[PDB]
Structures are given as structure tokens and as C-alpha cells.
Amino acid sequence: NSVPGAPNRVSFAKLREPLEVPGLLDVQTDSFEWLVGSDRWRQAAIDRGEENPVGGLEEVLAELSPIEDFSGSMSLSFSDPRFDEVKASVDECKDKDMTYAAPLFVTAEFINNNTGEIKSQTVFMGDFPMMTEKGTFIINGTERVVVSQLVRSPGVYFDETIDKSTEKTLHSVKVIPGRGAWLEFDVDVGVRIDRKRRQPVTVLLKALGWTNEQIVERFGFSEIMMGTLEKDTTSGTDEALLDIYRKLRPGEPPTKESAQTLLENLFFKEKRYDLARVGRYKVNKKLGLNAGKPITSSTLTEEDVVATIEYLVRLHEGQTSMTVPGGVEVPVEVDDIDHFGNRRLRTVGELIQNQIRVGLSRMERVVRERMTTQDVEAITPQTLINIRPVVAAIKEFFGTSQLSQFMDQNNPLSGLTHKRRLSALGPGGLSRERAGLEVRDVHPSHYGRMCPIETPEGPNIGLIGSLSVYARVNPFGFIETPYRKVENGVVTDQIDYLTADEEDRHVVAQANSPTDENGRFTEDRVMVRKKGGEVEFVSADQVDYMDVSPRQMVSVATAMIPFLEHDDANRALMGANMQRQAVPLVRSEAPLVGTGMELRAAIDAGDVVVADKTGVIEEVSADYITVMADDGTRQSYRLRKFARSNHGTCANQRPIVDAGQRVEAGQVIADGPCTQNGEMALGKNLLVAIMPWEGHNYEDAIILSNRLVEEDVLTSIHIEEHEIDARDTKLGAEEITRDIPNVSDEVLADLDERGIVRIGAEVRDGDILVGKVTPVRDTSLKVPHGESGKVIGIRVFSREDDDELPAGVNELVRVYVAQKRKISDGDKLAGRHGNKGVIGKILPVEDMPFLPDGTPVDIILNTHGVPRRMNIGQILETHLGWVAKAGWNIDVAAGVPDWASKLPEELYSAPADSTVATPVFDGAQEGELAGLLGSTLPNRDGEVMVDADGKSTLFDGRSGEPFPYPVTVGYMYILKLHHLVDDKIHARSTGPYSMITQQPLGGKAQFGGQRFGEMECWAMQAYGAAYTLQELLTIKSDDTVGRVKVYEAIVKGENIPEPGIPESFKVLLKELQSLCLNVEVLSSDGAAIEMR
Amino acid sequence: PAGTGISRYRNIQVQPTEEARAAA
Amino acid sequence: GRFATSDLNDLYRRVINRNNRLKRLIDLGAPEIIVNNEKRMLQESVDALFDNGRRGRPVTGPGNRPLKSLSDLLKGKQGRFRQNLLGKRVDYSGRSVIVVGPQLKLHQCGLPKLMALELFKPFVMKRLVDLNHAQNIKSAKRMVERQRPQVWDVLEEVIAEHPVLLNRAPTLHRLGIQAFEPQLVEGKAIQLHPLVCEAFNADFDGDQMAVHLPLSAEAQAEARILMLSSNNILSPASGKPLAMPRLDMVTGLYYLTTLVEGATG
Amino acid sequence: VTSIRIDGVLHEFTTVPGVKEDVTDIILNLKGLVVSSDDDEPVTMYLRKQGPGVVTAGDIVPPAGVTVHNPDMHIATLNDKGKLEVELVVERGRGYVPAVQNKASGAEIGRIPVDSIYSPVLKVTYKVEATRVEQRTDFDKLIIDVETKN
Amino acid sequence: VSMADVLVPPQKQEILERHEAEADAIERKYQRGALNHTERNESLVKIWQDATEEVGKALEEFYPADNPIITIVKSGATGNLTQTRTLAGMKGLVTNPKGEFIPRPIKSSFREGLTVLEYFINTHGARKGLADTALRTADSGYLTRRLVDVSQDVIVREHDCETERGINVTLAERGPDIRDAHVETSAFARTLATDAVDANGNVIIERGHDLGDPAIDALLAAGITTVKVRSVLTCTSATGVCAMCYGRSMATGKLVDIGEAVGIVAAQSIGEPGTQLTGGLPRVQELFEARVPRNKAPIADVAGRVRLEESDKFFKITIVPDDGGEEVVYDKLSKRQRLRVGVLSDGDHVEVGDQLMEGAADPHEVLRVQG
Amino acid sequence: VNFFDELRIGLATADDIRNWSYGEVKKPETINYRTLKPEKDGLFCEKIFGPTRDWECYCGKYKRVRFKGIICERCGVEVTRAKVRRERMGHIELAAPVTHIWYFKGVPSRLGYLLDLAPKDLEKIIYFAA
Ligand SMILES: [Mg+2]
Ligand SMILES: [Zn+2]
Ligand SMILES: [Zn+2]
């Protein structure tokens, strides 16, 4: 619906959508097209913004320019960040191990006042990484994402803390700039500036040049304030400048002239101290001043401070209604740091802009030196300019920094959520350990902005959110949510956007409104969201705003969970968390029961290939698709065939459209890794039965029918990348060549003469992937243990060849080995409702609870799980599934059945395998399914299988008897989860040990052991199993004689030698003797000894 | 020293019984 | 081609350099102020070597980060004791994903046959060379590597009543570790017993358990005698049975025994 | 089907020039074959469909005593540019076998193992009719519905 | 479980809408401003809690015994009446991120499906829960580490230190002439200190008796409302503890072994339920750390008669002694902390052992006062 | 070897540290940049700490297990197993003796409490400010 070429999904939508879900992956593209001077954003800003919208590069260059050596004799001013076309295609950039970037130019002039006038010119700095239409960067040939960072905005935060000593509340204010010193106001320490502990609040006022009568007039209301103005040794101005001079810095001779200039440099000067347009705007709107004032404002010099102290004074006075002279009237209350009106969102554009700023500041010093050392006039700024400190500042942002993450390519949705992410941790925010329990909890302002379901399950619970489907980021960097305006209980078709502080000042009504075509309210009063985001109930007189659509608040992953409202937030959270780890399958099929969001999410995610222009398909190949457009020119889209995605899974694409076929603009042509006819298809539709089955499903385990493993329905493709190189070490020079001296011939078979494996050769754990030689000894690349399968493709990056290569290394070789993972025992499965599980048992097709028509059910999920876990969703999802697969011509009635009184759009008939849409609030109702199961569907034979209640009488394949009561069978969408035995399973009898510690390693890659912790020792000692523990902590780990002696003794079949001398004790004895402590172990009686 | 690491445990002489020896 | 060294080397080098200079200052006959300054700097260097960041500013090498002194290798959360001396990774040990194996007796568990084959790799070789299955120990070590049909009939003979210690981190109580008899099962999953999940606190929702192989006769014995599930039914806490019907078996036996009127026969 | 061999592609995770779907989805479609083989030994069939058109299961040239019973099914679509040349190996087994590795066995690089399903039966059910009342010796009659691959 | 198997109770809506009628009046008085935010909140919360319990009762009553949810719940198999209450009828009241209850309840069952509002309000408690339980494991691990490190020494070293000293367990609730409920945790699986003498001296149980259910019952049937059991608290061992003074082990089902590491067993066993410990873990943490309480409730240094000097803002408590001398005075006594419930009134007599205010006695205070 | 009783701690006296040590460290050098063998009487050196690799002298004279206990007269390293490299400690002879920080910066300062000084005054004495 409203999408050209998609498989029509019949909808359980009770309410007609007034707005169409906006282009997903917006926050990346809008921000990045803001950062650089882009025409689309330019025109968007012309449509909604000021007459002259300044681009991020332009405004950082404006914030830098001009550079002077104080004097103002020599000047340098950059402008006009003009770009060319991109360096190469994305696929080529991923291929050649280079950065997908754009060459960057600036119109720079070197003004020289005393000498002759120098002209302007175009300066080239270097390549700047640009964002693809998939809203990602390709750094060093890997597809990296910049996640959006939640940070406390620059602005003025008022707070009230209850005193421990006295029974009197304390009002604390805290302003915080974009780049500068912290100013903070406190009631009685009075004011702190640049760690100047304890100063009277009036001093900084007096320093601004405020005479007594102006203190009495401005700060007349409230007590203490006047007593704080009174309480000071230096009442006079010059005295106060000397006082604050002495307080600011104890060292350096303090002069009155110097004090004023340093004060006015530290809190008035725009370059040294910087409060951004967000900060200026926030303090302006919160104080109420500069109402109808443009951008490009400066620091809070004086006029703000008066407003803040007045606001504080009124906050003490206890009267909300306030008006400041030369400012708009704002209400007086405490400011909440959790409220999203106060929490801004710094996005890719700004997060890059900061590093461009820091890099340009790093450049400004080098320029300031360069122009100082170089000759006057005869210098040339194009001639003398350092490129390093910016390219370094950018390269170092995408090199190792936490906010520049590897894109989650477990599927499209994983990517879409990864790019639509709100991170509270990292540089500029709060550290994971430092962050308290208050910051993590959801806040009523989160609604329709940050997902109050989706979050990681690890130590980052509530910290890393996901931005909500409909929410969009402002040029400022605030999270605006769309809503509908209502005039006197009559809703409008207009869509407005709210920043949160206005929504706080207004009343918002909920999306389940009694909606007729007119939209005039019939329900006398509706449930509404109050000023403090509290759930209230009011008549249409109070209601000014209403929720545009249901599922405002959900992320894309959260949105793609049908009957979410019947699930609990905890299991839903887990449902999303695991859904964005759901692996693509060799034959993906779209859910028979879903929401409409699956259709939309895939085509926006950008991993599917979309038809850029309206045309007719010219010819279809597996390699590429060529479309002949209306105009005459053709588009040839090249499909990435079996590309290793970042998280190890495959990114296989296929064409869906036929040769003789017309295709509209914005239509699905190719098939992504998790699309089948353009729809977010992660897992499969399987016939589930819900019951206990002979203890194989006990404690939320899952039972498979071998049919799945045989038919290859849940079979994935997993590609492990293996990288090795020939770097010229000081000894000689490394080589990638077939021939090694001390090897067998039979193992040197898969390799060709050059020393790489031939393409498609199946590898057993121990096989050679790259023949490499060290200066000759052998250091060849062998396939790691647990990994097997078919070699997709070999890449080579020769020193002689043009390819961009790391520093020192000559010839890089990467290997793609693909294992076709068949859903075996011990692999993780999960639904969409958080109902996880390990595959307890794969039954042979026949011994499987089967339908009266002879179809064996695929999975059996344990019943006891459901009421405990509190996620009945999966059962409604299951039920509807049966209605989805089993087509239903409802003999409606001569006067319509009650359940179908509020029946959705023409959803009375449905053919076999009818894929149904049910949104996460305006979806399929409780009793509807009771009507939907009561539906004739003679599956080949002239009989119904499932009853009115939705249960079926199953025959036990194993026993052969029928089950004594009818069990809840139905079709369920289940997801192949990434928590795989190829990741998790690990064994070690013996193996290769570490050099530093003398205990076995950790990890499957190095063939490590398994960690025997303290808590295991506690339990061993609780048993009192001295020998077991003392065997575990000596020969099994440490003792070098011990391990070889016990191996030798085991293989010989002799008594195990008594473990004598642990390495740990030697280490600690030697280490204690290194710190000059003489430690000697005495016996019960006699002389002491060394251990050996 | 806890559990099976006291001198009454770690030092236990287990001989096969005189009646069991000759019987073998 | 890069060299990985220890910070100690820098500090010892400083100390020995300062010492060897001071020696030459004594040899030449330098003024007492120079010599005493050298002695002060030496004192500072040795002081820093024994404990860095103990007095004033610490010594920093690359990028203004303080070097780990000798006392730094015996202090802090990550020096010694808290991590290094208390917990470490071991041999003759594995870790897999757990699944319910409801066929099994309480003393029995199930092992993934490959994982098992790797976990008893010597014990199988021993029997494979003690029998005429492998001609020589090297050839046995090849045959176990190739995983040939002749080892599987032996692995039952080697695993016959040979206990293994199942442990789940975090180990919250004594019954958090339990010994079992490993049955050999196909697949990639550890088949846990449904009764020991109350003890282990282990839901089958992607949780993983470590297996350990006791080697010494003492360890093997103690595994069989103390920590065998069949022995540890009652809680150390109270003495209420923890290895008891739970979740499913409860509803099963409850339905089985519940006497309801108005029924057939 | 036990093992397939395409002369073009070397392995399962690549593509053929001038086919719509790739050797993987081709292999997944070939599982839809209901080939019948009276021969106990491995028998080799051939398919050389050249030029533009849809390739069906009737376009295979089987040796004597090998029959394909659903030629209406869709394997792959070829453009005018493309040619698809495949030789399939049919063996007579029972139940299901995993795709045997061609590295351990002395088979060549060209051959792709397939997920072989030796199950000619498709669906099997039964229902037991009451038939004659409790008195005068009640007997069961079972009616078993059987559905094959043709 | 099926959409048809799970049933909403018929009284749910009848009750809910009958409570809505009063909730409307509460919210009306709150809107008028005749009742305070806290009073209105309290009243509404109380009402809708009563409604929640009513819906719980309806869920309890309506469902047949053959119903699978009742089977999975009321067999004790898993969950509780609360979960089937949240699944059938109404989820009930749900708290803010602070912990204070939102006056608007979740009137819709998870069968019925939640409204955006109701769900969005439900998220808070779920996430807060997930976070606090995600911390609880680490906190309880940390506690268990200390509780292991402290009792590193307590191992059964010898058989018996040969003492007659023992702690005195009541074993019976003031007769009857009324069995104690916590015998199983207290005096069960314990070795005795003395011979169980009765009124006459018809000695029923001798020294070194395991105190099994037969013996415990026999001691009740004898007609004694106390017994002196032999414990670790009174063990005269040089190193660790002596077997016989510990009592019988729980693991073995016999007399505790002469090797047993009862200390680290005790440490593990006390350390384990901290994850399941949902007044809570702070109290056990602060009790085991022996730190000054969150509410410093005073205990009586001397026995005497209590008098109430109802002072301004706070209280003042004075105990007039029996022996004769000075009366014990404390300056500021917290009114909100609440006096101890025989209840505290002007002109009663209270014991030396008795804590004066309801909360937590300062262990050091109790030690130095009593012993 | 296998047995143990009560462990005791003390202060490592210069004579006891010398009695521990097998040779003196008297060079600031770590290892040779070309051959990557450790230099004589530097850090890691094979003379005092024993040999680097199992049964090997520095120059390369003896690599047989037959010869056990013999010390090569060419370089002066003792041909034994490489494990001893974790069991062998060195020593550094200081021309002037310096104090240990542990008995100084610890609260209270013990050195100062033995000779009744203020810790600042002791600091001034030991750090050549008095
Ligand atoms: Mg779990
Ligand atoms: Zn005792
Ligand atoms: Zn030599």
C-alpha cells in the first residue's frame, strides 16, 4: 500500500493512517546532508528555516576564520566548502580496502594589512569520508556506522536538593557550554568558575559593572540573595574585579585592566568560550529572552545572568508567573535533566563537525606558528598549510572511537536499528560505570522519540536506546515527533512536529480516538498525556494535540513484533534485541502473520536494490539487473553475490522481477539477504504445536522436525574472513607462496602454484587457506578449528598494484570460507515475543505430533514458559498464523457477525497462505481471532483441522496414540538466532599455551581452555574436594613439568603424579622476593627448603 | 586443608585384609 | 615484526643506568652536589620501580601513561590475587550449549560426541594403543585427529563410569557444580538432566555450561563420591530436596495424581 | 539427487552467467525433483538448455530406468546471452543423508554435494472408524491416507 | 495455552467500573483540590489495589480446576496468582521509575491487549526491574565474595571439643496447654546441649540426639516449650569448629563429617539466594557488614516503666527504672520511624531486650547494652 | 618439595638478596637488535639467569642432555632446562645504598617511627634536602 511493486498484505488496521510512515534511516542522511552544503537540505531549510541556512563545514570554518597573531597584521579566512563527485563506487571501495570519501576544497585568502594586498585561492586538504544512501560509511573497505549520541544539551538547568542539616530546600543552577569553562550558581559556595571554589554570587554581577541600586532593583525579591550581595569583603567594583581575579587564578600579577579582559575573554569572547546555537536558543527560550532573535549568537555576557538570578530568585519566591524586562514571560519551575526538551541528540553531522572543529583547532596552532616563521607576503597559504591535523582528527574518529561502530549486518533491520540508534555512553557523554541507575530508566518524554522497549540486555540496559519510527532530528539537534492538531474537538489533516517542551505546555490525546471521516469526537472525554507526562482523562475542550498514528513510540525492530501489546516490555525488549540478531536463510520467506512495517523497513533499509527510475526491465541476470527507463537511458544495478557481511553472515542478493515486466520508481527489483519480494523476512513460518512433549522442551527448550534440516528451511550461510600478509621483517622478507620445506604433499593440494587455495575447495579444520613462509620456517595461514565449508573467493593486494595498503606490509591476502549452517542440536531458536530456546531434540520427520491430514508440526514450545514469562503474544501470533496459512471464505452472514462489527478493510475473504498485517496497537483484537479461527479451510481433504477455540486433536508420531485433549497447534514465525555452536561449543584436552601466563588460553580461535573461576573453587571447597581443586589449579592449568608428566602418565596408563610446584607460587615467591620481602616456608620441625 | 585435606584423611594406609590376601 | 616488552625493563634500565653513572661519578671524583643529586634521582628511580605513583608524579613512557612498577604487579583489582591467583583457564575441560535430556538417569548426562572425542583425546588414545586398533602412539594421535569409525566403540569403553564435573558461571552455590556420567550423544549440545536445573539455575535460553575431566584417581573418586548429583539431592541451605519435580514434571504428576469426579470408568 | 556438477561454477556460493537465480537457489529448486531410479548404482543425467527461456524438469535427458514426474516445476530462467549446462548424479538410498564432503572422499572440485532426501512418500495419515457398536464384539477399522511424490 | 483457554473473568469489568465510579470522585476531589495530591494518590492507589485484589479473587473463582493456567499456576508448577491475575482481568497498579505508584491502573488484561498509554506506563517497572535484577547478580556476587572471604577458616577440625554450652530454641509457640513454624530452620537437624528434662524430670531425650521429626515431635508431646541445642555459637574449639557442636549436615543426611568445610558451605548457601532476594538486600548487606542502621531505633539499657513526653516535631522516650536511680533520656526520636508495637503507651513496663522504635537495633549498642 | 607447613615473611637483607642472586646486573642493555640474544651482564642475560632455550650455551658449544651441571668456560652460562628462567632472580649492587619506600610512604611511616622523625623531616633526610 503506497509502495509500487510489493505482495499485497491484507490489513487488520481499524484506523486509517493520516500520515505515511516517514523515510526510515532519516536521522543519518538529514544530518550528513546538513553537515556539508547540500542542495536538497538547502531547499528543505529554505522551505522550513531562515533565509540563509549555514552548512556544518561553513559554520565550523566561520567559527575558525579569521586566524590572527593578536596584532591583526597577518589574517587567514577559509570559506566555501565545495565538493566534487565521489572517488569511486561503494562496491569498489569495499573491494580495494580504501575509504569511500570525497575530495574537499576551501576558498582561502591570506590578508596582509601593512604590506601589499594578497588575493584568494582554492586550497585542497584531503579526502573526507561521505555517507552512502544506506546511511553508512565505508572506512578501509569495511561498512562502519556513526550512532547518534544522547548528551545533556548546552543550556540552563535549575534543580532543588533537600538539605540534610536544615529542613530547607536548596536551589542549584548549572549552565554548561559547547566549548568553555563551567559556570554554576548555588544558594547559601555561591558561584564557581573554572574550579574557583566558593565565591559570592554578586561579585561576577559587580564585575559586569552593576551599581548597588541595580542589585537592589534587579535582585530585590527573595531574601538570602540580598544577604549574599551583602556578605562579601569586596563590595566595590574594582575591588570585586581584583577579588574574582585573585579567585580565578592565584598565580600571575592581578591587575584590574587584566582581570576585566580575562573575565570578558573567559565568558564574553566568542572564540575562547563557545555556547552553540542550541545553547543560546535553550537559555534564550528557557529564560524567556531574545524571543524572535536569529542564530549566530554569542556567550551569556550579562543580560542572561540577570534573567538566571531573577529566575532563581522567583524559584525561591514561589510564584510560577514571571515576566523579565526586555524578554518574553516564561513559567518558573525546576528543570529536569531526564526531560527530552533538555536532552539534545548530537548526530553523525555534529559528531563529525566536533572532530573537524578539534582538527581545525589543531591546525590553527600550526598555522599560527607557520605564518610566524614564514616570510611576510611571500608565504602563499596554499603553499604553507598543514593537512595532517584534520585528516588525523577525522581518521582517528572512525579509527578506534566508541561512537564510530561496525554496522550490525546480521540483517537489514539490525543495520536500520544500528543506524537509528541513541547511545548515552562514549566520549562527551557519561561512562558506563560512572552512569547511575536514574539515567537508565525510561522517562515520559521518551514517548515517540526513544524506544521504551528496545535496548541491549548486557551492562548497557536503558543506556543504548533506538530512535522511534516516526521521530526526526532538527538542524539544532533535538528529537521532534509528529502529531495532529485538533480544533475544538475537530481533528485536522495537518501534521505538526513537537520538540517536547511545547508538548509539555500542551495536552496530547492518544491514537485510539473514536475516528469517523469528519473526526469530530463522539466519546465525551479521552485519555490524554499531562504536562509532567502523567496519564490523565479530559474532554475535547482541553485537547489541542493528538497522536498522528499508533506505534509512534516503537523502534523498527520493536514495530516488527505482532501483538506487542499482548506481550510484556521485558519479553518484548528481548524480542527486539534477538530480532536484530536474526540470521538470513538460504530460502527466506516473509511472515504469514506480521505488521505492515516489514514491507516498508526492507525497502528503506537500503540492503535491497530499489528501482531509482520508472521503466521496463531490459534483461535479468543473477550478476546484475538492467532496466530500460521512460526517457531512454538504462540503469544497470550490479548485485553483490555472496558478500561476507560484518557479523559473519552472508549478504546474498537475487533478482525478483521478470524480463518482460514494467517497474515504477521506488519499486523492489532485487532480493536482499532478508527480503523475499521486498519484505523484512529474517526467519521462517513453521507449524508450531504448544504442549509439553516427553521432557525435550522442559524449561523453554525447543523441539525440531528433521524435515526443517532436510528441506533446508532454517539453513543459513556463514562466511568467516581470514586475513594474512607478507611484511618485510628485519630478519629477511616474508612471502605468500605454495612451497614449504617440512610438510607433506597431500596437504599441499587445495593450493595452486602461487600458494592460494583454488576457488570452491571444501576445507577440513587443519587445511591451509594461504601458503605463507617466514624467513626458512613455516608461518602459513591454516583454517581455524571449528570452521569448515567452501572457499567463495580469494583477494590479493600486491605492493606493485595500485591498491591502498597498510604501512610496511607488501602483499595482503584475505580468504572467504562459507559454511552452509544446517539448524543442528544446541543452536538457538526464538520467536518475535522474546520466547528464546535451544534445540533440545531434532526428531526424525515421522516421530512428531502430526495433524489429522498427516502434516508433522515443525516445533513444540513448552506451555509452562508462557504464563510465567508473561508473553501470550506468541500464542495469538500462532493462532492468527493458522488463519494466515488456512485460507478463509467467512460465510459472513445475512446481517454480519458481532466479532466482525468493527471488521477491518474488506478482510472477510482470504485465499490459501494469505499474509496478514496487524500493527502493534491498531491490530487484531482479542475476540476477532475467535471469529477468524471459526473459518472453513478444507486443506485438500473435505474436513477442518483446528477447532473454534483454535486447538487441534494431534496423533503422537512416537507413541501412535491420539493426545487425550486437543492441543494448541498453529503457524508461527520463528527466527534463526546468531548464538551458534560454531561460536559457543569449545573443548581442549591439551593444546597450545600462552608464553606470558603458563595456563591455557581463552577463545576457540587459539584453541583455548575454559575458565575455572574463584566461585568454582568456593564450590569445590564447599564439597571439600581438595584433590579435584588442587588438580585443577596445578597440572590442569599452570605446572609445566606437571602437564607433560600427567599427559605422559595418562598415555602410558600409570598413576597420576602428585602435583608439587605450581607456577603461580613460583611467580608470587619471585615477585615478593623482587619487592625485598624475604619469604621462607618452615616445616613442622627441622630446617627450611627451596621448592626444587 | 578443608574436606579431604586433613592429616587424618590425606594420610590413610589402606592394606588388603589378612583373610583377603591368602584368599587372593 | 613488532617487539612486545614489559615496563619493568624501563625501570630496571633507569635504575642500572643511574647506578652505573653514579659509580663513574664516584670513580672520577665529581662534586658532592652532583653525586647527591644523582643519588636523589636514583632513590626516586628505585622508589618508582618498587612503587610508581607512590611519591609525586609517576614515570610515563608512551603517550603520558604511568608504567606498572613491581608493587603494581602485586596490587589493584587486576595485579594479582583478585583475578590472577583465584581464577584461571584449565586443560581437560570444555564448554557447550546445554539442552534438556529427559531420557537420562540423574547420575547420567549427555556429551556432543565430537566434543567428547576431543575431551578424552588421551584416554581414547591409551585404550586405542593398549588394544591393537592403533599400531603406534603417533598413529593413534593421527587416528583420533581423523576421527575414524574404530574410536567410537572404544570411547564407550574409555568413558565407562568415568565422571565429568559440570559447572555453570556464575557458581552461586555448592550444587552450582555437579559430577555426572557422560553418555555419548550426536549433535553439538550438552544434554543436562531436567532435575539439576533448579540447582544450576540454568534456563535453556542460550545458557552454556563448562565440563571438566578429573584425571587423578583421587579426583575421579571424589567426583563419584561427593559431588555426584544422585548424592546431592538435599539443599546445603535447609536440607529440602532441590533435585525434585519442577515446572513440567509438577504439572505432569499433578495431572497424574489429581482425583477428579465425573470421569470415565 | 546425490551430487550435482555444473561445468560453469566451481561451488555452491557463486553464480552462472545469464541465469536469473544462482546455483544455491537452483540447488534448492532441484530438491523439488521427484526423480525415480530402478538402478541400484549411481546414474548420471544431463541438461544442456541453450538460449532464452525457462528451464523445466522435463528438459533433463535421463538414461533408461530414470523418470521425472512433475515437469511443470520451475528450476531457473535463462536470458538469450546465458547457457546452463548441468549433469546430476542420482543414487538409490532411503530416509535422509547429509551432503557428504568431496574433500574427505576422492571427488573433484567441480562436483557440488546436495541435501539428498531418499523419501518418495510425501504425506501419510490415518483415522480409526468405530464400525459396529460396543455389544456383539466391537472391532476397529483403520483408514490410512497415503500421498507420494509420484 | 490458547486465546480460548485463557478466560477474562466476568466480574472484572463489573468491579473495575464500580471502582471507576469512586476513582472518578477521588480524581474529582483532587481536581477540585479538596483532597491533597498524596491523599488522592493514596485513596486511588488503595481503591485500584482493592480492585486488583477483587479481579484476582474473580480470576481465582471463575476458572475451572481442569484449566491449564490454574494447572501451571495453582499446582505450584510455576508463576503465582499474581501472574494469572495480570493475564486474566487486569495487570493492576504499576510504579514510576522512582517507585511511587501511578494512580491510573492497567485495567486491560494481556489477553485484552494494552493501550499505548498502559504499555508505555508498564515499560517503566519492567525496565527498572531488568536493571535492578541486572545489578542484583553483581551486588549478591560481591556480598557472597565477602561472605566467603570472612569464613575462610570455619572448617570442622575435630570430632568434639567436649562442651556442655548451647543456644536455647523455644521449638513451640507458648504451648499448647501451638507448635512453632520455624523449627525446621532453627532446632531441626541439630545436636542437643542437655537432656530434655520436663516438669517432673521424666527425661525423654539424652545428649547427642540428631533431633529428627520423631524426636522434635516427641519433645512437643513431652510438654516442654523450650530446648537447649548445641551450636557453633558455643563451640570451645582451638581451630575452626568441632563436628558434634555443628549438628547433623544437610547434604549427607547423617552426623556432619570430621572434614566438612561447613564455613564455606554456609557462605555459599547464604550467598546463593541474593539473586532471588527481591526492607531487602541492603538490610542483610548492612546486618552482615554490622554497619549502623538506616533507622537508628534505640534499645533499653535498663528495664523500667515507659513515659511519653510528646515533644514538638520529634518524640522523647523515658524509662523509669526498677532498681532506682536515673531515667534513660534520648534527645530527638523520629516520629515517622514509629514506636515499637503489648503496644507502647504512656504507663507500661518494657523489657531490657525490647527495642523501643520499629526498625533496626544498632548491633554495637545491643552488644554493649546486653552482651 | 611435595610437603609444606606454616609460611613466614620478613625483610630481604642485602646479604640475603646477594645469597639469592646467581650473578650481578651491570649493563642497561636488553637484547641485541640483529641476532636477538641477550647481552652479557644486561637484562635477560644468560650468564646469571641461566640459558634462553632448552640445552643451549650463548656462543653455541653444548646442546646435549648428556652434559648436566657443567658450566661452559667460553661464555660462563650453565647448560640446564629453560624453566629456571622463571626461578632465577638477579641483583644490582648500588655504589650508595638507597631506602625502601614501603616503610616510608606507608601510613604511618615505619622507618621514621623507628628513628623518631616526622615523615616530612624523614622525607627531607632521605631525599637529600637535609
Ligand atoms: Mg537465562
Ligand atoms: Zn564444640
Ligand atoms: Zn658457551
Side-chain angles (χ1 to χ4, degrees), chain A residues 571 692 694-701 727 729-730 764-765 785 824-826 828 836-841 862 864 868-869 964-965 981 984-991 993 999-1003 1007 1009-1020 1022-1028 1031-1033 1035-1038 1043 1046-1047 1050-1053 1056-1057 1059 1064-1065 1067-1068 1072 1074-1076, chain C residues 1 3 12 50 70-71 74 80-83 85-103 112 115 118-123 125-126 129-130 137 141 145 147 165 167-171 173-175 177-178 186-189 191 194-195 197-198 202-208 210 212-219 222-223 226-227 232 246-249 251 255:
Chain A
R571 303 314 305 182
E694 295 200 30
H696 292 278
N697 60 336
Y698 155 79
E699 186 71 291
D700 295 18
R727 197 205 304 272
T729 316
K730 61 185 65 64
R764 179 172 44 76
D765 44 1
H785 209 297
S824 64
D825 298 61
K828 193 162 177 181
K836 320 211 191 211
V838 194
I839 294 155
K841 196 70 181 162
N862 188 11
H864 305 96
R868 178 193 63 170
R869 288 274 160 285
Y965 313 91
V981 298
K984 288 199 167 174
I985 208 182
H986 192 24
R988 185 208 177 94
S989 159
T990 182
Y993 298 81
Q999 61 91 44
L1001 281 160
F1007 194 64
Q1010 279 299 333
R1011 192 154 190 83
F1012 187 87
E1014 185 190 17
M1015 299 67 69
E1016 283 81 57
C1017 320
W1018 296 346
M1020 283 294 105
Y1023 278 120
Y1027 275 87
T1028 62
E1031 220 65 16
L1032 275 147
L1033 269 288
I1035 55 150
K1036 287 204 196 173
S1037 57
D1038 298 315
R1043 56 198 177 77
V1046 67
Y1047 194 80
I1050 288 158
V1051 67
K1052 282 175 165 47
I1056 305 308
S1064 53
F1065 183 55
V1067 160
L1068 202 81
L1072 282 162
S1074 82
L1075 286 161
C1076 306
Chain C
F3 286 118
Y12 277 107
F50 288 139
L70 289 163
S71 182
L74 274 81
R80 287 281 158 190
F81 304 128
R82 289 101 202 170
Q83 309 299 333
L85 268 294
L86 259 42
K88 58 202 55 52
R89 304 150 208 282
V90 299
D91 286 305
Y92 306 86
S93 54
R95 177 168 290 177
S96 325
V97 193
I98 54 162
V99 294
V100 58
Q103 68 271 27
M115 203 278 287
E118 182 50 50
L119 199 61
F120 295 77
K121 183 175 198 292
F123 277 66
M125 269 177 63
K126 172 177 65 63
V129 297
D130 281 26
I137 297 103
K141 190 161 196 190
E145 172 263 14
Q147 302 150 25
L165 316 172
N167 56 305
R168 192 190 142 285
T171 299
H173 50 243
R174 185 177 62 96
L175 310 191
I177 323 295
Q178 300 186 48
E186 73 184 27
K188 307 279 89 164
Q191 311 217 323
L195 286 178
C197 299
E198 210 170 326
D203 301 336
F204 300 111
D205 48 24
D207 283 317
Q208 46 172 15
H212 304 314
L213 179 56
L215 292 178
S216 280
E218 287 82 341
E222 199 138 48
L226 264 59
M227 46 186 73
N232 317 120
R246 58 189 311 266
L247 307 180
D248 293 41
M249 288 166 270
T251 52
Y255 164 82

Side-chain angles (χ1 to χ4, degrees), chain A residues 477-486 489 491-492:
Chain A
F478 281 117
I479 315 178
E480 272 197 335
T481 303
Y483 303 91
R484 290 162 92 248
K485 187 158 281 152
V486 45
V491 300
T492 61

Side-chain angles (χ1 to χ4, degrees), chain C residues 3 5 8-10 12-13 15-17 19-20 22-23 26 36-37 39-44 46-48 50-51 54-56 71 74, chain F residues 24-31 33 36 43-44 89 92-106 123 126-129:
Chain C
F3 286 118
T5 192
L8 267 45
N9 295 313
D10 173 276
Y12 277 107
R13 185 194 68 236
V15 166
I16 190 56
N17 184 26
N19 170 47
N20 288 344
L22 182 55
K23 278 184 186 168
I26 305 308
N36 290 152
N37 180 41
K39 285 191 202 194
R40 171 165 80 230
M41 290 150 66
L42 180 77
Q43 156 76 348
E44 285 185 53
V46 172
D47 283 341
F50 288 139
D51 203 324
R54 191 65 174 281
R55 182 168 170 282
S71 182
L74 274 81
Chain F
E24 186 186 348
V25 183
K26 60 165 71 184
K27 301 220 166 202
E29 213 267 11
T30 58
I31 43 163
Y33 76 102
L36 295 167
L43 277 173
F44 309 100
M89 294 199 72
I92 309 165
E93 294 279 315
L94 311 187
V98 294
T99 196
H100 210 260
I101 195 166
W102 283 31
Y103 326 114
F104 161 77
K105 197 60 185 67
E123 176 190 51
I126 66 161
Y127 289 107
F128 303 85

Side-chain angles (χ1 to χ4, degrees), chain F residues 72-86:
Chain F
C72 190
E73 56 257 54
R74 272 227 73 174
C75 46
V77 315
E78 192 163 24
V79 180
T80 182
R81 291 156 193 77
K83 56 178 163 61
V84 296
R85 289 287 294 247
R86 310 220 82 180

Side-chain angles (χ1 to χ4, degrees), chain A residues 306-309 311-314 316 318 320-326:
Chain A
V306 182
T308 59
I309 64 171
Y311 200 108
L312 176 139
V313 152
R314 287 289 179 284
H316 276 262
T320 308
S321 299
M322 183 194 196
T323 311
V324 304

